[PDB]
Amino acid sequence: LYFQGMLIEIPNVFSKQEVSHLREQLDARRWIDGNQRKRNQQLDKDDPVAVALGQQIMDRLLAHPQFVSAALPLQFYPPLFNRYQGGETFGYHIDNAIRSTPDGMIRTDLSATLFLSEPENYQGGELVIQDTYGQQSIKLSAGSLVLYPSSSLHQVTPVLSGERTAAFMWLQSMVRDEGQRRLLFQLDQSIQSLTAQTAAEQELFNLSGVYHNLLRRWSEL
Amino acid sequence: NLYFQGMLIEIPNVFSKQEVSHLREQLDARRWIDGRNQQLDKDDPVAVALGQQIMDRLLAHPQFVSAALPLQFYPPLFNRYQGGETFGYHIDRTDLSATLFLSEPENYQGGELVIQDTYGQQSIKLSAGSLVLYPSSSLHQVTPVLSGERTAAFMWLQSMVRDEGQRRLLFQLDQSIQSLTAQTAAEQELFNLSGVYHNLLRRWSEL
Amino acid sequence: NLYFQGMLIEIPNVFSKQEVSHLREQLDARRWIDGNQTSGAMATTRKRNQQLDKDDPVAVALGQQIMDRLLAHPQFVSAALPLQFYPPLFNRYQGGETFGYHIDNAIRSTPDGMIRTDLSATLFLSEPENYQGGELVIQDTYGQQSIKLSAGSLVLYPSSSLHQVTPVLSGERTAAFMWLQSMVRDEGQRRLLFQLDQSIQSLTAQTAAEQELFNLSGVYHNLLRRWSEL
Amino acid sequence: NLYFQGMLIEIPNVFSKQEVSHLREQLDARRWIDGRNQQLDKDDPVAVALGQQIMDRLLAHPQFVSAALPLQFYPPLFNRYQGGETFGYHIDRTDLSATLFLSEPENYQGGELVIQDTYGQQSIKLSAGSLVLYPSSSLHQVTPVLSGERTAAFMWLQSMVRDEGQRRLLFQLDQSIQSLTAQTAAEQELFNLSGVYHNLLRRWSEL
Amino acid sequence: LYFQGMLIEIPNVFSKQEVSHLREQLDARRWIDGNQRKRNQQLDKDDPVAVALGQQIMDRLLAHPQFVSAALPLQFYPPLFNRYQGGETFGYHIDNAIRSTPDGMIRTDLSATLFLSEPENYQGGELVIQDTYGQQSIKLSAGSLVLYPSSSLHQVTPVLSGERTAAFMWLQSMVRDEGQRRLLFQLDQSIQSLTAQTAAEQELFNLSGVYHNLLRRWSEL
Amino acid sequence: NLYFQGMLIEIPNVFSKQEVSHLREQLDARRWIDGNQTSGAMATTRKRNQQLDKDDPVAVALGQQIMDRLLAHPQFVSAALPLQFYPPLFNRYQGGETFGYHIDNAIRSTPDGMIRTDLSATLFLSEPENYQGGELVIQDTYGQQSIKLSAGSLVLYPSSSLHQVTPVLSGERTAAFMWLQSMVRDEGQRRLLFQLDQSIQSLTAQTAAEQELFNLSGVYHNLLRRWSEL
Ligand code: NI
Ligand code: NI
Ligand code: NI
Ligand code: NI
Ligand code: NI
Ligand code: NI
């Protein structure tokens, strides 16, 4: 779990075997073209395999304690499967703050990309994110996830060779403010480390009480 | 660009003159009930259908979407004022109220939508096909129509941003970003400003 | 006139003895499922008890009767200012069954969406004299308390407390447990509202000047409006 | 008990009629400057001394102290309106503004202190020796005095509670506690209510 | 350091020897009577010995880390020296939320009594405090301090035998909200215990960072 | 056009080289006092350096010249939105002198009252090439950075950071350090204001339509008003 700047990497969300089973199912579906500057391919949002596998990705992420701690998810925009090859790219843009989903409107606090192609198997296709804190290129291993704020100016550089398949999504967090969400995450991770280091049980409970209190003060459901 | 006249915004030419005639042709053929003013029944099928057309047109209007940040519409109602008919001072979650004018302001005497502000009040009668958008909490009235007739569509809506000041600040920021986009201003600054806009929208929105 | 015991409040006689008996007659004829698994505690907890399935029709129905009764109880409404309940769950403790020290999760999922757990509540459905042990021990910054109330009484307490149900070594403890999100998030604000309300009620009972009662009610409703998050 | 007439409070009989005559006797002997109305110089020693007497009397008045929760006074100024003299609509940290009336309202034509509210506006002319207290942010005017003369003391002050609504809620709570104290209500409830009052004052005060 | 309910006891703020030296100085001064229902004795606020020794009490309290942690003092109402004997008492009352001091107005967040008589040496003179949380009688050892919220309904019961000398004061905290102030105190004390238990330095720093952040979010200076 | 490096910002050439030289000439002739004692760090810290006394007249005077210069610097004002400074202190590091890992206190006392330490700042008064070591290492949740800037440049950073000054093993590092309370408490808000301001300045330099510049400035001032605590 790497906390490189403003963005967080969750490695091995799915295994290499699970990624292959995901790809065998996804590759069989009908990849539709589009320009919605952008030129790439996607599975239709209502494709039943896309819907089913997107639910599997959400279930898996919701079963990951570090993901849950870092993002405190309230509601996901259902995963969207995308593909970039032969010069396909998504130019610099800012994501909209509000997005319409099948179960109402959500505030896009965080964006997330699950990689379904190995980085060595495609030239280009880097996810470049740019903020007031800085700039980074992201091209993680198949099964790994990058979680980043939706406010970032970003792009997917052209894939000049091979192909890049990934699941993309947005999510509304229970904690709106990034500063508050990072403080909670910091406190939770200290509690986890102290638990692993066998610290006094009374202090683990006291700190967990502080955490509970802050989450109760700052959450918006 | 189109600014805010204090605490209220005018969206001109939501419908063309030809379109407004076509709306009036359909509306005028319906049964107007004496409910002091007049109106079409909320469940009148032509009122419900034109109400839906008004909503679709408004949601397709970037300036309206930006000004209101609509979350939920309450279906438009159709009213009419003539021969001394008026609506006294009153306050009407409805965040915003709107009137789409369906009669030209010159074709009737009186019938001014008077809306109170912090600084005083504003009297509004816009061109047929134009809309006025204002906070539902504002004290307001429709002065008597002593000659001619005033037909209009009136509606309420929940906004994504409940605070009036926050909603205008966002609108002004958005409107300036568009104007700079038409002027071909530096890309990096257009992005930096949009970033500021979306950050404020993330801070202030309630869905 | 009800008062807090530190950070908790007891609401007595929510159901009569005869109603508790009828509730038990219905509950006892259902399928009680052994549970050694925690759900709702912040860290891993040593739990061993019996429960009715959350979707048991009789459990759902009586859960609704409990919520309906609580919503009709003026002192419960004043103390908790309920916005949304996590539907009541029925649990039982006997033969060494216990729920170890833990803190309840701040956020819980319910069928009608996610709620913030402002307050926890237990409706007692066995008489405290009829079982040994089974004390709800609630600990916080401002002290510690052991609670076993009369059948049909309810205890209301913050979900943030460090708490446990000590082992029941003889007899059986049956109860309905729940959480709720209050209209008022902050505990200090919610307690000030309860205090103001309760004073208005005492002054009403004492036959105080109606204009003063009216004015104080106006103050109460203005505060409630300012501090509520609906 | 004495309630709030919407967003403004009237404090009657701050000074008696005899005392008001004594204040006017001293004030009327001074040099009034044409600064459209009139006033005494801020550094006029009799104006400064009577200004201090007004402040002392007000700070000794439980209803005023409770209504304003004064933190800091800006020294009272003395104005006069006659023969068409008026003060147009305007907004004036000054939290509150106050006028102590030094002429009987019947002894002059016009000269109404008009103050805008959320619901509309209020026209105020009180008895000599009475005071009106209102938010400084309120839009207001003094209508022309067409006959007789209107002498008054006007002042601003920082309150301990900046929010108008919070300040009225506290005042109403306090006023009800006093009334119940005069009625010999149960001691325990009088204490419980005072506890609620002081808790709100602790939450809302800015010193 | 006992956290009995809503109130906190700080024992041995001054030693028994220091209390005797305080009392030798205080007993020489002119004790003035008054009814400001109340009947007790006090030293005049402008008595130079009272002013000097009050400063010593504030200096000592500001040098006590647990006092500083619990109260987070911003400004004190200078200590007032009081004495109860021969039926003298202070009946049930609520302290005013706002108090005027020589250096401006303060909000009375907390009240505090430093005991300068041993409890065994006077019959009665109990400080009875009553809140929504409950009720307590307080009559601590000479040199010990009780710190309690100023919102409490309270009294000093009559002293029927001997005498009770004490320093009383109010203080405005940097953190207005009691709930927030207790959470900070809880977090600080966990950090101190973990430091004493030799927990990983990185976690002590992380938790101290959380504390710093919360104090910066909630303080009012 | 200045930009943040993660959570910190460098303001270059606050004073010219000639002015830094004149500042050093005045500072060097004063009495430097050996200090092994921490003041302003949250926990006990291993510190060993030299400082000028806080009440040294020349230190007070040059501290005022530094604050005056910073207040006249548009980019410093935009980044920090200063409300109140803790008056600058002059420190020096040589011959193994260092300031170990610590976090600065959230609240500091000053002669004109208590301040909240929103931001920390160091004005460099030795060239980074003229000493070995003495890097200001600033660490937080979002990364770590080592800073040694040109003489007369300033680094501005959050006081919440875990940070140290690594040992100076050759030459000497002289600097002025300070804290400040910003008009805007929240760092996220303060950064959004800086971003908006800086864009308006770039658009001004690019000769953008004056009505748009005016409108954007109105937005900026409305935000500043909403988020300031004066
Ligand atoms: Ni994107
Ligand atoms: Ni209306
Ligand atoms: Ni529990
Ligand atoms: Ni005025
Ligand atoms: Ni007292
Ligand atoms: Ni430091």
Q: Which residues contact A52 (CB under 8 A, 6 or more apart)?
A: none
Spatial separation of the C-alpha atoms in residues E122 and A64, rounded to whole Å: 63
Residue F107 tokens, joined: 């609240």
Does the beta carbon of B26 lie under 8 angstroms from any beta carbon of chain A?
Answer: no
Q: Which ligand is nearest to the CA of F99?
A: 6
Spatial separation of the C-alpha atoms in residues A86 and A122, rounded to whole Å: 10
Give CA angle at B106 (B104, B111), nearest 5°.
80
Residue B176 tokens, joined: 């300036």
Instruction: Give residue F127's Cα distance to chain centre.
Output: 17
Identity of the amino acid at C89? L
Are E139 and E193 part of one and the same domain? no
CATH number at residue C205: 4.10.860.20
Spatial separation of the C-alpha atoms in residues C165 and C174, rounded to whole Å: 12
Put simply, the answer to whether C199 touches D179 (Cβ < 8 Å) is no
- Binding site members of A for Fe cation: 93, 95, 154
Q: Which residues contact F162 (CB under 8 A, 6 or more apart)?
A: E205, E209, F101, F102, F103, F138, F139, F140
Give D118's DSSP letter. S
Spatial separation of the C-alpha atoms in residues F129 and D79, rounded to whole Å: 70
Residue whose C-alpha is closest to residue F24's, from F155, F170, F151, F168: F151
Asked whether A221 and A174 are in contact (CB, 8 A), the reply is yes
Identity of the amino acid at C228? S
- For residue B89, the tally of other CB atoms under 10 A from its CB is 11
* DSSP run (H or E) holding B174: helix B164-182
CA distances from B127 to A25, B109, B110 (A): 58, 14, 14
Selecting from E107, E150, E177 the residue whose C-beta is nearest the C-beta of D207 gives E107
Asked whether B45 and B122 are in contact (CB, 8 A), the reply is no
CATH number at residue C33: 2.60.120.620
Angle, nearest 10°, between helix axes F187-205 and F210-227? Answer: 160
Give D29's DSSP letter. T
Give CA angle at F79 (F75, F81), nearest 5°.
105
CA distances from B21 to B10, B17, B104, F158 (A): 21, 6, 11, 63
Are B141 and B189 part of one and the same domain? no
Q: Which residues contact C229 (CB under 8 A, 6 or more apart)?
A: C183, C184, C185
Are A119 and A188 part of one and the same domain? no
Spatial separation of the C-alpha atoms in residues A140 and A147, rounded to whole Å: 12
Angle, nearest 10°, between helix axes F57-71 and F17-28? Answer: 160
Asked whether C119 and C86 are in contact (CB, 8 A), the reply is no
Are E36 and E128 part of one and the same domain? yes
Spatial separation of the C-alpha atoms in residues D69 and D160, rounded to whole Å: 6
Sign of CA dihedral C49, C54, C55, C59: positive
- Domain edge (last residue) among C182, C202, C222: C182
Residue whose C-alpha is closest to residue A176's, from A211, A145, A149: A149
**Domain membership of residue E38 as a residue range:** 1-173
Residue whose C-alpha is closest to residue C5's, from C157, C180, C124: C157
DSSP string, E125-190: --EEEE-SS-EEEE-PPTT-EEEEETTSEEEE--EEEEEEEEEEEEEEES---HHHHHHHHHHHHH
Spatial separation of the C-alpha atoms in residues C195 and C207, rounded to whole Å: 18
How far from each other are the two terminal CA atoms of chain F, in whole angstroms?
Answer: 27
Widest distance between CA atoms in chain E: 59
Identity of the amino acid at C115? I
Are E146 and E205 part of one and the same domain? no
Residue D120's SS3 state is coil
Q: Which ligand is nearest to the CA of C105?
A: 3
Q: Which residues contact C109 (CB under 8 A, 6 or more apart)?
A: C115
Output b/e per residue, C202-219; b: 16+ Cβ within 10 A: bbeeeebbeebbebbeeb
Spatial separation of the C-alpha atoms in residues E184 and E208, rounded to whole Å: 11
Using H for helix, E for strand and C for coil, what is the string for chain A? CECCCCCEEECCCCCHHHHHHHHHHHHCCCCEEECCCEEEEECCCCCHHHHHHHHHHHHHHHCCHHHHHHHCEEEEEEEEEEEEECCCEEEEEECCCEEEECCEEEECCEEEEEECCCHHHEEECCEEEECCCCEEEECCCCCCEEEEECCCEEEECCEEEEEEEEEEEEEEECCCCHHHHHHHHHHHHHHHHHHHCCCCHHHHHHHHHHHHHHHHHHCCC
Asked whether D145 and D85 are in contact (CB, 8 A), the reply is yes
Does the beta carbon of A221 lie under 8 angstroms from any beta carbon of chain C?
Answer: yes
The reply, when asked if residue C173 is annotated as ligand binding, is: yes
Q: Determination method here?
A: X-ray
Give C65's DSSP letter. H
Residue whose C-alpha is closest to residue D98's, from D156, D43, D44, D145: D156
Identity of the amino acid at E146? V
Structural domains of chain E, count: 2
Q: Which residues contact F21 (CB under 8 A, 6 or more apart)?
A: none
Are F141 and F46 part of one and the same domain? yes
Residue that the structure tokens 């997107």 belong to: A54
Residue B154's SS3 state is strand
Sign of CA dihedral C80, C86, C89, C94: negative
Spatial separation of the C-alpha atoms in residues D8 and E140, rounded to whole Å: 50
Spatial separation of the C-alpha atoms in residues F115 and E74, rounded to whole Å: 11
- For residue D22, the tally of other CB atoms under 10 A from its CB is 14
Resolution (angstroms) equals: 2.3
Instruction: Give residue D80's Cα distance to chain centre.
Output: 17
Residues 109-168 of E with CB under 8 A from C: 132-134
Q: Pairing state of beta strands D87-90 and D140-142?
A: antiparallel
CA distances from B191 to A75, A153, A182, F78 (A): 27, 7, 25, 20
Residue F118 tokens, joined: 């929103």
Asked whether A218 and A175 are in contact (CB, 8 A), the reply is yes
Q: State the chains in contact with C (3 or more Cβ–Cβ pairs under 8 Å).
A: A, D, E
Put simply, the answer to whether A187 touches E199 (Cβ < 8 Å) is no
Residue that the structure tokens 């979650």 belong to: B93
Spatial separation of the C-alpha atoms in residues D145 and D165, rounded to whole Å: 32
CA distances from E13 to E6, E17, E75, E144 (A): 20, 12, 19, 6
Spatial separation of the C-alpha atoms in residues B55 and B48, rounded to whole Å: 11
Rounded to 5 degrees, φ, ψ at C38 are -90, 140
Spatial separation of the C-alpha atoms in residues C14 and D100, rounded to whole Å: 57
- Are B and A touching by the rule of 3+ CB pairs within 8 Å? yes
Are D106 and D145 part of one and the same domain? yes
Residue whose C-alpha is closest to residue C126's, from C140, C113, C111, C136: C136
Are A161 and A186 part of one and the same domain? no
Spatial separation of the C-alpha atoms in residues B78 and B47, rounded to whole Å: 7
CB pairs under 8 A between A and F: 28
Asked whether F179 and F110 are in contact (CB, 8 A), the reply is no
Does the beta carbon of F207 lie under 8 angstroms from any beta carbon of chain A?
Answer: no
Residue whose C-alpha is closest to residue D132's, from D162, D108, D111: D111
Are A99 and A180 part of one and the same domain? no
Please give the distance, rounded to the nearest whole angstrom, from the Cα atom of residue B15 to the centre of ligand 2: 23
Asked whether F106 and E216 are in contact (CB, 8 A), the reply is yes
Q: What is the dihedral of CA A193, A194, A197, A200, to 10 degrees?
A: -170
> Which residues does chain E break after (C to N > 2.5 Å)?
36
Chain D interface mutation, best of E100, E107, E129, highest count of D Cβ atoms under 10 Å: E107
Q: Which residues contact D54 (CB under 8 A, 6 or more apart)?
A: D76, D100, D153, D155
Asked whether C140 and C162 are in contact (CB, 8 A), the reply is yes
Asked whether A176 and A220 are in contact (CB, 8 A), the reply is yes
Put simply, the answer to whether F216 touches B193 (Cβ < 8 Å) is yes
Asked whether C102 and C139 are in contact (CB, 8 A), the reply is no
Spatial separation of the C-alpha atoms in residues D138 and F18, rounded to whole Å: 55
Residue D39 tokens, joined: 């006033």
- Domain edge (last residue) among F159, F182, F205: F182
Q: Long-range pairs for B168-172 at CB < 8 Å and ≥24 separation?
A: B168/B4, B168/B7, B168/B9, B169/B200, B169/F219, B169/F222, B169/F223, B170/B66, B170/B69, B170/B197, B170/B200, B170/B201, B170/B204, B171/B4, B171/B9, B171/B66, B171/B67, B172/B3, B172/B4, B172/F215, B172/F218, B172/F219
Residue E63 tokens, joined: 């040098």
Are F145 and F84 part of one and the same domain? yes
Spatial separation of the C-alpha atoms in residues A83 and F23, rounded to whole Å: 61
Spatial separation of the C-alpha atoms in residues D10 and D126, rounded to whole Å: 8
Are E10 and E119 part of one and the same domain? yes
Asked whether D179 and C212 are in contact (CB, 8 A), the reply is yes
Asked whether C126 and C171 are in contact (CB, 8 A), the reply is yes
CA distances from F159 to F7, F103, F140 (A): 11, 7, 11
DSSP string, F105-170: -SEEEETTEEEE--EEEEEE-S-GGGEEE--EEEEETTEEEEE-PPTT-EEEEETTSEEEE--EEE
Does the beta carbon of B192 lie under 8 angstroms from any beta carbon of chain F?
Answer: yes
* DSSP run (H or E) holding C114: strand C113-116
Residue B205's SS3 state is coil
Identity of the amino acid at F200? I
Asked whether F87 and F63 are in contact (CB, 8 A), the reply is yes
Residue whose C-alpha is closest to residue E68's, from B160, F134, C98, F107: F107
B130 CA: distance to closest CA in chain D (Å): 28
Sign of CA dihedral F133, F138, F141, F142: negative
Residue that the structure tokens 């506890």 belong to: D195
CA distances from A188 to A67, D160, E203 (A): 12, 40, 11
CA distances from F66 to F14, F17, F52, F90, F127 (A): 9, 14, 15, 11, 18
Are C77 and C152 part of one and the same domain? yes
| Count of residues making up chain D | 207
Residue that the structure tokens 């966990």 belong to: E190
Give CA angle at A199 (A194, A205), nearest 5°.
80
Residue B129's SS3 state is coil
Put simply, the answer to whether D196 touches C199 (Cβ < 8 Å) is yes
CA distances from B142 to A195, B9, B89 (A): 68, 17, 8
Instruction: Give residue A24's Cα distance to chain centre.
Output: 22
Asked whether F165 and F122 are in contact (CB, 8 A), the reply is no
Q: Pairing state of beta strands D150-159 and D96-101?
A: antiparallel
- Domain edge (last residue) among C182, C199, C219: C182
